[PDB]
Amino acid sequence: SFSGYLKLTDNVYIKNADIVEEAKKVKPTVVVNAANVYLKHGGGVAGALNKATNNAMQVESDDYIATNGPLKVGGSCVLSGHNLAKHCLHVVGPNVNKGEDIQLLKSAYENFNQHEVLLAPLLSAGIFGADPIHSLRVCVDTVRTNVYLAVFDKNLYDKLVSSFL
Ligand SMILES: CC(C)(O)[C@H]1CCCN1c1ncnc2[nH]ccc12
Numbered sequence: 001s002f003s004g005y006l007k008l009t010d011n012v013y014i015k016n017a018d019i020v021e022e023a024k025k026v027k028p029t030v031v032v033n034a035a036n037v038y039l040k041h042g043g044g045v046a047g048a049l050n051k052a053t054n055n056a057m058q059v060e061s062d063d064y065i066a067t068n069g070p071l072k073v074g075g076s077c078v079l080s081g082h083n084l085a086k087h088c089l090h091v092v093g094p095n096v097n098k099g100e101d102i103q104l105l106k107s108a109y110e111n112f113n114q115h116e117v118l119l120a121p122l123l124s125a126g127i128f129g130a131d132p133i134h135s136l137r138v139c140v141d142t143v144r145t146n147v148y149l150a151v152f153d154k155n156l157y158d159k160l161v162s163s164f165l
Protein backbone atom coordinates (compact mmCIF):
# COMPACT_ATOMS: atom_id res chain seq x y z
CA SER A 1 0.00 0.00 0.00
CA PHE A 2 0.95 3.68 0.30
CA SER A 3 4.33 4.52 1.86
CA GLY A 4 6.16 7.67 2.88
CA TYR A 5 3.20 10.05 3.16
CA LEU A 6 2.83 12.90 5.63
CA LYS A 7 -0.58 12.90 7.33
CA LEU A 8 -2.26 16.30 7.07
CA THR A 9 -5.68 15.41 8.53
CA ASP A 10 -7.74 12.38 9.47
CA ASN A 11 -8.18 11.59 5.76
CA VAL A 12 -5.65 13.61 3.68
CA TYR A 13 -2.06 12.48 3.10
CA ILE A 14 0.69 14.11 1.01
CA LYS A 15 4.02 13.08 -0.55
CA ASN A 16 6.62 14.55 -2.91
CA ALA A 17 6.19 12.09 -5.78
CA ASP A 18 5.33 11.63 -9.44
CA ILE A 19 1.76 10.30 -9.53
CA VAL A 20 2.75 8.04 -12.44
CA GLU A 21 5.48 6.36 -10.41
CA GLU A 22 3.21 6.11 -7.36
CA ALA A 23 0.54 4.47 -9.51
CA LYS A 24 2.98 2.01 -11.06
CA LYS A 25 4.28 1.08 -7.60
CA VAL A 26 0.96 0.84 -5.73
CA LYS A 27 -1.56 0.05 -8.51
CA PRO A 28 -4.37 1.64 -6.46
CA THR A 29 -8.07 1.08 -6.92
CA VAL A 30 -8.48 4.69 -8.14
CA VAL A 31 -5.98 7.12 -9.63
CA VAL A 32 -7.26 10.64 -10.31
CA ASN A 33 -6.40 12.34 -13.58
CA ALA A 34 -6.31 16.14 -13.81
CA ALA A 35 -8.42 16.15 -16.97
CA ASN A 36 -9.90 18.76 -19.26
CA VAL A 37 -13.51 18.57 -20.45
CA TYR A 38 -12.43 16.96 -23.75
CA LEU A 39 -10.30 14.26 -22.09
CA LYS A 40 -7.43 15.40 -24.32
CA HIS A 41 -4.45 14.21 -22.29
CA GLY A 42 -1.76 16.42 -23.74
CA GLY A 43 0.48 17.46 -20.86
CA GLY A 44 0.96 17.70 -17.13
CA VAL A 45 -0.55 14.92 -15.05
CA ALA A 46 -2.85 13.84 -17.89
CA GLY A 47 -0.16 13.68 -20.55
CA ALA A 48 2.12 11.74 -18.19
CA LEU A 49 -0.56 9.25 -17.13
CA ASN A 50 -1.61 8.71 -20.72
CA LYS A 51 1.98 8.18 -21.90
CA ALA A 52 2.43 5.52 -19.22
CA THR A 53 -0.60 3.67 -20.68
CA ASN A 54 0.96 3.66 -24.18
CA ASN A 55 -1.90 5.99 -25.32
CA ALA A 56 -4.59 3.45 -24.36
CA MET A 57 -6.09 6.01 -21.98
CA GLN A 58 -6.47 8.47 -24.86
CA VAL A 59 -8.08 5.87 -27.14
CA GLU A 60 -10.60 4.94 -24.44
CA SER A 61 -11.21 8.62 -23.69
CA ASP A 62 -11.90 9.51 -27.33
CA ASP A 63 -14.53 6.76 -27.50
CA TYR A 64 -16.08 8.10 -24.27
CA ILE A 65 -16.32 11.65 -25.66
CA ALA A 66 -17.63 10.45 -29.03
CA THR A 67 -20.46 8.72 -27.12
CA ASN A 68 -21.19 11.18 -24.30
CA GLY A 69 -19.82 14.59 -25.22
CA PRO A 70 -17.53 16.65 -22.99
CA LEU A 71 -17.52 16.66 -19.24
CA LYS A 72 -18.56 19.70 -17.23
CA VAL A 73 -15.97 21.86 -15.52
CA GLY A 74 -16.20 20.49 -11.97
CA GLY A 75 -17.35 17.10 -13.26
CA SER A 76 -15.80 13.68 -13.65
CA CYS A 77 -16.07 10.25 -15.20
CA VAL A 78 -14.78 6.82 -14.20
CA LEU A 79 -12.78 4.98 -16.87
CA SER A 80 -10.22 2.19 -16.84
CA GLY A 81 -6.96 2.59 -14.96
CA HIS A 82 -5.20 0.45 -17.60
CA ASN A 83 -1.79 -0.68 -16.26
CA LEU A 84 -1.72 1.99 -13.52
CA ALA A 85 -4.81 1.35 -11.38
CA LYS A 86 -8.12 -0.47 -11.44
CA HIS A 87 -9.95 2.74 -12.37
CA CYS A 88 -9.05 6.26 -13.41
CA LEU A 89 -11.30 9.03 -12.11
CA HIS A 90 -10.94 11.84 -14.66
CA VAL A 91 -11.76 15.07 -12.79
CA VAL A 92 -11.99 18.54 -14.37
CA GLY A 93 -10.88 21.38 -12.16
CA PRO A 94 -11.37 24.94 -13.38
CA ASN A 95 -8.67 26.31 -15.66
CA VAL A 96 -8.02 29.85 -14.44
CA ASN A 97 -6.14 30.57 -17.68
CA LYS A 98 -9.50 30.10 -19.47
CA GLY A 99 -11.41 32.33 -17.05
CA GLU A 100 -13.20 29.40 -15.43
CA ASP A 101 -14.72 30.01 -12.00
CA ILE A 102 -12.34 29.02 -9.18
CA GLN A 103 -15.42 28.17 -7.09
CA LEU A 104 -15.80 25.09 -9.31
CA LEU A 105 -12.67 23.66 -7.65
CA LYS A 106 -14.78 22.63 -4.65
CA SER A 107 -17.24 20.89 -6.99
CA ALA A 108 -14.32 19.11 -8.66
CA TYR A 109 -13.04 17.77 -5.32
CA GLU A 110 -16.55 16.58 -4.35
CA ASN A 111 -16.16 13.86 -7.00
CA PHE A 112 -13.50 12.27 -4.78
CA ASN A 113 -16.14 11.53 -2.11
CA GLN A 114 -17.66 8.79 -4.30
CA HIS A 115 -14.50 6.66 -3.76
CA GLU A 116 -13.21 5.27 -0.47
CA VAL A 117 -9.50 5.69 -1.32
CA LEU A 118 -7.78 7.65 -4.09
CA LEU A 119 -4.31 8.52 -5.34
CA ALA A 120 -4.57 12.06 -6.69
CA PRO A 121 -2.84 15.29 -7.72
CA LEU A 122 -3.84 18.74 -6.52
CA LEU A 123 -6.59 19.88 -8.86
CA SER A 124 -6.32 23.09 -10.89
CA ALA A 125 -2.58 23.34 -10.16
CA GLY A 126 0.04 23.08 -12.88
CA ILE A 127 -1.12 24.36 -16.26
CA PHE A 128 -4.63 25.01 -14.92
CA GLY A 129 -3.21 28.13 -13.28
CA ALA A 130 -4.60 28.05 -9.73
CA ASP A 131 -2.58 28.45 -6.55
CA PRO A 132 -1.65 24.98 -5.22
CA ILE A 133 -1.87 26.28 -1.63
CA HIS A 134 -5.51 27.19 -2.24
CA SER A 135 -6.13 23.85 -3.96
CA LEU A 136 -4.81 21.95 -0.93
CA ARG A 137 -7.06 23.99 1.38
CA VAL A 138 -10.12 23.21 -0.73
CA CYS A 139 -9.12 19.54 -0.83
CA VAL A 140 -8.83 19.29 2.97
CA ASP A 141 -12.12 21.17 3.47
CA THR A 142 -14.05 19.15 0.85
CA VAL A 143 -12.80 15.56 0.57
CA ARG A 144 -13.97 13.20 3.33
CA THR A 145 -12.66 9.94 1.85
CA ASN A 146 -9.00 8.89 2.07
CA VAL A 147 -6.86 10.81 -0.40
CA TYR A 148 -3.14 10.34 -1.05
CA LEU A 149 -1.79 13.44 -2.79
CA ALA A 150 1.31 13.18 -5.00
CA VAL A 151 3.03 16.55 -5.47
CA PHE A 152 5.70 16.42 -8.19
CA ASP A 153 7.62 19.54 -7.12
CA LYS A 154 9.84 19.37 -4.04
CA ASN A 155 9.91 23.11 -3.32
CA LEU A 156 6.11 23.25 -3.64
CA TYR A 157 5.67 20.19 -1.43
CA ASP A 158 7.82 21.79 1.28
CA LYS A 159 5.86 25.06 1.04
CA LEU A 160 2.51 23.26 1.23
CA VAL A 161 3.56 21.40 4.39
CA SER A 162 5.24 24.33 6.12
CA SER A 163 2.30 26.73 5.56
CA PHE A 164 -0.53 24.28 6.27
CA LEU A 165 -2.96 26.08 8.58
C1 LIG B 1 3.29 19.75 -9.47
C2 LIG B 1 1.88 19.17 -9.23
C3 LIG B 1 1.01 20.22 -8.50
O1 LIG B 1 1.96 18.04 -8.41
C4 LIG B 1 1.13 18.81 -10.58
C5 LIG B 1 0.85 20.06 -11.50
C6 LIG B 1 1.89 20.06 -12.63
C7 LIG B 1 2.28 18.56 -12.79
N1 LIG B 1 1.95 17.93 -11.49
C8 LIG B 1 2.15 16.54 -11.27
N2 LIG B 1 1.76 16.06 -10.06
C9 LIG B 1 1.99 14.73 -9.77
N3 LIG B 1 2.53 13.80 -10.56
C10 LIG B 1 2.88 14.33 -11.77
N4 LIG B 1 3.48 13.56 -12.77
C11 LIG B 1 3.69 14.40 -13.88
C12 LIG B 1 3.26 15.67 -13.59
C13 LIG B 1 2.74 15.67 -12.24
Ligand SMILES: [Cl-]
Pocket residue numbers: 034043044045046125126127128
Ligand atom coordinates in the same frame (compact mmCIF):
# COMPACT_ATOMS: atom_id res chain seq x y z
CL1 LIG C 1 -1.29 19.25 -14.73
